[PDB]
Amino acid sequence: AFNIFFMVYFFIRFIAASDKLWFMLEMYSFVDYFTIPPSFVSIYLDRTWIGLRFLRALRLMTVPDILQYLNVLKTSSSIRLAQLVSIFISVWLTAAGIIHLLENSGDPLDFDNAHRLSYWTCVYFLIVTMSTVGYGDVYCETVLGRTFLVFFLLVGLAIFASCIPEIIDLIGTRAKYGGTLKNEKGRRHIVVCGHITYESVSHFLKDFLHEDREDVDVEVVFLHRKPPDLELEGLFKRHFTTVEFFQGTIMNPIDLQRVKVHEADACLVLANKYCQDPDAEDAANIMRVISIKNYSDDIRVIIQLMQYHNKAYLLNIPSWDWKQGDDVICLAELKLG
Amino acid sequence: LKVRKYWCFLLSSIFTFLAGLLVVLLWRAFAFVCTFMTEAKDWAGELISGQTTTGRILVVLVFILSIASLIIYFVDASSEEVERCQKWSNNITQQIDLAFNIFFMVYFFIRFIAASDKLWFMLEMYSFVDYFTIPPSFVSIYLDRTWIGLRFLRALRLMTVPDILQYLNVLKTSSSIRLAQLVSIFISVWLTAAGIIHLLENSGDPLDFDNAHRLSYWTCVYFLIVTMSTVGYGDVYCETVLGRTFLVFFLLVGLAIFASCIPEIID
Ligand SMILES: CC(C)CCC[C@@H](C)[C@H]1CC[C@H]2[C@@H]3CC=C4C[C@@H](O)CC[C@]4(C)[C@H]3CC[C@]12C
Ligand SMILES: CC(C)CCC[C@@H](C)[C@H]1CC[C@H]2[C@@H]3CC=C4C[C@@H](O)CC[C@]4(C)[C@H]3CC[C@]12C
Ligand SMILES: [K+]
Ligand SMILES: [K+]
Ligand SMILES: [K+]
Ligand SMILES: [K+]
């Protein structure tokens, strides 16, 4: 019942083929040549043979094509991952079928040195070979089995060494920093963005959380684009109950929702004082204030500014209001003062 | 050993995980249809991170019994048999195991309170270790018989050593933190995988248990390092169906760990 469907599917593919000569030599059609015709012969002969039924595993390499036809796979990484997994599994299962047939049948024209091996033992034997472990508990004994193993060792080992490392890093690790900040009743928090480094965060947290000042239950939420390094991650661990970090940009309205800017007491924009171009640094920080004010107008913003002539741009923003608590800390004005 | 009660140990661990999973979901529904918790949640989170003086003691105390729990598992796996019945009062090893396990459940409860969301906490990797470790101890207490079970999961607790050292500010530079993470990950995976091989090979195939392969735990440790190095002497190899099945999955991922951790540890 399955084979008759595949021949009419083969005929449909034949009609759709642009050139018939190259279609007959296609890899997929070669699978159908050695699969369906044996079924009819076994029907007339009233006897069954395992034959080359292992070639059905080669049909798994068209799964990424099938998923792309239905638009299930969209991003490039998912397409690459699907191709590598499908190729590795199909080759692994097909090679195990070849070993299973050659070993169990025995040498041709005598068929007296048959080696009894289960198919799943051959699957286990194949993965030991591709990993280059080679226990030797299971090994090929027939001439044909060893002959195929010689060719497989040349090409099969390269597939394992190229697919598995690329599969692992493509999967990667789950995003450690992400998701929305959990809402709490009667909770006060501030959002700190801009120049977020280990030196800037540690210096800020020491001054912000000092037992010489009044005790207030305000927690700090950090938003930055680049993931933190190991030193910064350890610092956040030591302040687990009062400091939270999220990965994202203040210019993305989605990320502003994640950190709950509209519910924050104030937004603090740190600046890179040791920057090559003070004008470029000031322009980036000014755009951050515009993004925050665009999301909501009644949010207190405190921003570190590098040069005084850039202060006019912030003052000309319609939503900027010094009465409501918006402040500009100009390093050039304060230092020279 | 006429009838094996290993299913009772597995059923209780599955039931405990399922009961806790639905209770959290039911409590969310119960809360939906219907100040101390907030105060306790902040206090609990401060304790597990070792911010206060009592928090530092608990974090250090967690380190001490994490190694101790694994050590008593080594002497427990040295037994020739995997299943045996004995009075709990006769052996002092079971008594010490109970003393360590009761601490880990109250430590689990403290971590549960400190958790921001309870649903994701129940699915955490660390909590999965506690699901299959402590509930079997109580079942073995009532059944008056002991089983090796999944006690090898205690080695997974070693991956929190870098977190413990970071809580106490022992690790400061980035290189030391990276080195601690790689060493802890490699050792925990190596010891856990050896425990899986030791259990599967010694127990035998399920529902028959007649093809058991007698292997010591340290032989499995030696077998694992030969596998990850891709040397494969073949003097020691898996014979059971379940043992080979796990080896197939380990060869896909375990070999990558060795090839990525050891070169990075050396330099
Ligand atoms: C594309 C064509 C020309 C390639 C050559 C045809 C191939 C596929 C055919 C022709 C001869 C056939 C082989 C003849 C003899 C044997 C030995 C038997 O115990 C297993 C099958 C096996 C190994 C056959 C496999 C398929 C085979 C190799
Ligand atoms: C997270 C949950 C859903 C995963 C599935 C539950 C797992 C952990 C449980 C359910 C069935 C259990 C298995 C049932 C049978 C056996 C065979 C026995 O000789 C060794 C233990 C072993 C191998 C058990 C290991 C643990 C097990 C696999
Ligand atoms: K090798
Ligand atoms: K070898
Ligand atoms: K080898
Ligand atoms: K060998």
Side-chain angles (χ1 to χ4, degrees):
Chain A
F2 287 167
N3 266 343
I4 61 107
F5 157 79
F6 276 122
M7 77 169 337
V8 317
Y9 177 58
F10 171 79
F11 288 146
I12 290 175
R13 264 185 305 121
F14 175 77
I15 300 168
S18 180
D19 48 332
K20 314 308 188 198
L21 180 273
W22 267 30
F23 174 83
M24 298 319 252
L25 292 206
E26 262 176 23
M27 195 229 79
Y28 209 85
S29 50
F30 259 151
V31 173
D32 290 349
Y33 287 164
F34 297 34
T35 292
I36 307 129
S39 185
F40 303 139
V41 168
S42 95
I43 275 302
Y44 154 74
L45 261 184
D46 219 24
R47 61 184 305 149
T48 183
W49 177 41
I50 185 79
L52 317 158
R53 285 209 262 278
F54 50 81
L55 288 177
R56 294 167 180 183
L58 283 184
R59 282 197 258 257
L60 285 181
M61 288 181 302
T62 59
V63 157
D65 285 356
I66 289 315
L67 295 177
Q68 279 178 70
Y69 289 153
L70 314 164
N71 214 1
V72 188
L73 299 169
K74 309 181 188 70
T75 161
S76 178
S77 277
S78 71
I79 296 163
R80 187 55 177 161
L81 180 57
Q83 289 176 345
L84 291 169
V85 168
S86 77
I87 280 159
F88 177 75
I89 292 178
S90 92
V91 164
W92 182 14
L93 293 187
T94 311
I98 303 177
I99 291 288
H100 166 83
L101 160 81
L102 290 183
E103 289 298 301
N104 288 262
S105 85
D107 274 336
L109 259 59
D110 49 327
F111 301 103
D112 68 313
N113 59 335
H115 186 203
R116 263 281 326 147
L117 275 185
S118 148
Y119 175 76
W120 301 112
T121 300
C122 298
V123 172
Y124 158 77
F125 166 72
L126 255 293
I127 194 51
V128 170
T129 292
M130 292 183 275
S131 56
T132 73
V133 168
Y135 288 126
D137 44 349
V138 180
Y139 58 95
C140 296
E141 292 171 335
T142 69
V143 165
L144 281 201
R146 287 178 167 187
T147 309
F148 168 73
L149 212 43
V150 168
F151 301 132
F152 182 82
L153 280 176
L154 290 168
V155 303
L157 257 53
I159 296 205
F160 187 89
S162 276
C163 280
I164 298 306
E166 201 143 332
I167 281 170
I168 294 298
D169 50 24
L170 261 173
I171 287 173
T173 43
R174 65 189 185 280
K176 186 141 36 74
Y177 301 104
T180 321
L181 165 90
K182 283 327 160 229
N183 50 81
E184 301 184 7
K185 289 183 175 179
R187 191 255 317 259
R188 282 173 61 208
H189 81 281
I190 59 165
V191 179
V192 175
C193 57
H195 192 241
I196 304 297
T197 58
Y198 174 76
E199 299 292 331
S200 87
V201 164
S202 62
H203 177 87
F204 173 79
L205 281 188
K206 262 179 263 137
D207 211 89
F208 196 83
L209 320 158
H210 213 267
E211 68 313 76
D212 272 336
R213 81 198 321 150
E214 266 307 316
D215 290 344
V216 278
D217 218 20
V218 186
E219 47 152 327
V220 193
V221 174
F222 285 98
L223 188 68
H224 200 232
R225 254 185 319 251
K226 320 162 197 150
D229 60 337
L230 290 184
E231 258 198 311
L232 201 42
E233 287 182 22
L235 186 57
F236 293 146
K237 263 177 250 292
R238 264 162 270 136
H239 301 93
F240 163 68
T241 199
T242 168
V243 166
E244 220 149 336
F245 181 84
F246 295 96
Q247 177 138 350
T249 167
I250 214 83
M251 312 294 304
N252 200 341
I254 305 304
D255 300 347
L256 296 158
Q257 164 71 39
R258 287 174 45 215
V259 291
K260 272 157 192 25
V261 154
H262 51 283
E263 294 168 357
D265 255 31
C267 206
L268 273 71
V269 188
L270 282 166
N272 187 15
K273 317 170 315 228
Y274 321 110
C275 65
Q276 215 72 57
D277 195 7
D279 251 24
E281 179 72 26
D282 268 349
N285 286 331
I286 283 172
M287 282 298 306
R288 296 196 219 265
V289 178
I290 290 176
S291 169
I292 293 151
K293 288 304 196 170
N294 170 58
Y295 186 73
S296 60
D297 60 354
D298 58 322
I299 167 74
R300 192 183 171 204
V301 172
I302 308 156
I303 169 188
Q304 255 168 10
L305 224 43
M306 284 295 268
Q307 284 160 325
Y308 192 88
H309 64 260
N310 295 114
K311 194 180 171 169
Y313 304 145
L314 281 175
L315 292 172
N316 296 340
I317 285 178
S319 30
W320 192 263
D321 199 356
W322 175 77
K323 259 56 162 298
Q324 307 302 318
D326 295 354
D327 273 297
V328 163
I329 288 149
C330 188
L331 306 177
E333 182 217 44
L334 286 155
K335 161 191 56 185
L336 291 205
Chain B
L1 267 81
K2 302 174 180 178
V3 58
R4 278 163 191 269
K5 305 285 187 175
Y6 75 103
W7 54 274
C8 328
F9 295 90
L10 293 162
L11 224 55
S12 93
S13 291
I14 295 170
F15 275 170
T16 321
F17 155 73
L18 285 179
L21 194 59
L22 72 99
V23 150
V24 161
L25 223 44
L26 163 151
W27 192 275
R28 254 152 76 147
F30 269 8
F32 159 70
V33 304
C34 300
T35 60
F36 170 63
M37 263 283 258
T38 56
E39 205 267 342
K41 172 173 296 181
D42 207 72
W43 150 84
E46 180 152 32
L47 213 58
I48 62 167
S49 55
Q51 314 206 6
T52 71
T53 295
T54 165
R56 300 230 315 174
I57 294 313
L58 171 67
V59 155
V60 152
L61 187 92
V62 152
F63 191 161
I64 296 307
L65 327 185
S66 266
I67 315 284
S69 210
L70 185 60
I71 282 188
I72 77 96
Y73 162 69
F74 290 158
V75 319
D76 213 75
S78 293
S79 160
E80 333 287 335
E81 272 301 319
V82 291
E83 287 216 41
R84 52 218 182 109
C85 329
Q86 193 182 16
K87 179 139 182 126
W88 68 309
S89 287
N90 299 359
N91 47 347
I92 68 184
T93 311
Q94 208 161 351
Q95 257 88 68
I96 303 187
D97 210 8
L98 205 37
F100 287 167
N101 266 343
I102 61 107
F103 157 79
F104 276 122
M105 77 169 337
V106 317
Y107 177 58
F108 171 79
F109 288 146
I110 290 175
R111 264 185 305 121
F112 175 77
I113 300 168
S116 180
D117 48 332
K118 314 308 188 198
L119 180 273
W120 267 31
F121 174 83
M122 298 319 251
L123 292 206
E124 262 176 23
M125 195 229 79
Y126 209 85
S127 50
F128 259 151
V129 173
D130 290 349
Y131 287 164
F132 296 34
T133 292
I134 307 129
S137 185
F138 303 139
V139 168
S140 95
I141 275 302
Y142 154 74
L143 261 184
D144 219 24
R145 61 184 305 149
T146 183
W147 177 41
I148 185 79
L150 317 158
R151 285 209 262 278
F152 50 81
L153 288 177
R154 294 167 180 183
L156 283 184
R157 282 197 258 257
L158 285 181
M159 288 181 303
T160 59
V161 157
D163 286 356
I164 289 315
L165 295 177
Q166 279 178 70
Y167 289 153
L168 314 164
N169 214 1
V170 188
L171 299 169
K172 309 181 188 70
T173 161
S174 178
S175 277
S176 71
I177 296 163
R178 187 55 177 161
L179 180 57
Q181 290 176 345
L182 291 169
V183 168
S184 77
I185 280 159
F186 177 75
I187 292 178
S188 92
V189 164
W190 182 15
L191 293 187
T192 311
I196 303 177
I197 291 288
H198 166 83
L199 160 81
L200 290 183
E201 289 298 301
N202 288 262
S203 85
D205 274 336
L207 259 59
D208 49 327
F209 301 103
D210 68 313
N211 59 335
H213 185 203
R214 263 281 326 147
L215 275 185
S216 148
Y217 175 76
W218 301 112
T219 300
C220 298
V221 172
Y222 158 77
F223 166 72
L224 255 293
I225 194 51
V226 170
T227 292
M228 292 183 275
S229 56
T230 73
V231 168
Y233 288 126
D235 44 349
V236 180
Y237 58 95
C238 296
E239 293 171 335
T240 69
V241 165
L242 281 201
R244 287 178 167 187
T245 309
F246 168 73
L247 212 43
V248 167
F249 301 132
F250 182 82
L251 280 176
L252 290 168
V253 303
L255 257 53
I257 296 204
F258 187 89
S260 276
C261 280
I262 298 306
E264 201 143 332
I265 281 170
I266 294 298
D267 50 24

